[PDB]
């Protein structure tokens, strides 16, 4: 054709982590929550099929799948770790998904809680008409 398209989508990955007043019965010291969302309350479900959070193997059932927003996991724990996150698209071509290795870090007692935000730009060059329609509703 005479024309081509490049679509850019912004994602926000982030987490909050707080030292518990009182450890859990297992002795877990922190409460945390990790999330994937669009910026400024934008709807990313238009183009996201699901978000898979791969927790550390010490967690029971570490593969946590979110098929609907909010795309998040809340847990209690004792150590920070790398958390691979897979964002799956409502796309029939490539790419079908994208992966981010998210640093789920915790702060020691006596320091402010963690409130971290990580911004990611995705670029889709010449998506299918169908995927383009989904991306550009978001």
């Amino acid at each position: 054709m005479a024309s081509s398209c490049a679509v850019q989508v912004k994602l926000e990955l982030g987490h909050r982590a707080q030292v518990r007043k009182k450890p859990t019965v297992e002795g877990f010291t922190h409460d945390w929550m990790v999330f994937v969302r669009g910026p400024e309350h934008s709807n990313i479900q238009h183009f996201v099929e699901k978000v898979v959070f791969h927790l550390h193997e010490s967690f029971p059932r570490p593969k946590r799948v979110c098929k609907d927003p909010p795309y998040k996991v809340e847990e209690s724990g004792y150590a920070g770790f790398i958390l691979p996150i897979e964002v799956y698209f409502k796309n029939k071509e490539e790419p079908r998904k994208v992966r981010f290795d998210y640093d789920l870090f915790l702060h020691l007692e006596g320091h402010p809680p963690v409130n971290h935000l990580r911004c990611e730009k995705l670029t889709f060059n010449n998506p299918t008409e169908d995927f383009r329609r989904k991306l550009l509703k978001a």
Binding site: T29, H30, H56, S58, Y78, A79, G80, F81, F105, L106, H107, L108
Partner: peptide, 5 residues
Amino acid sequence: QTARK
């Protein structure tokens, strides 16, 4: 930061 695993 706390310890890691």
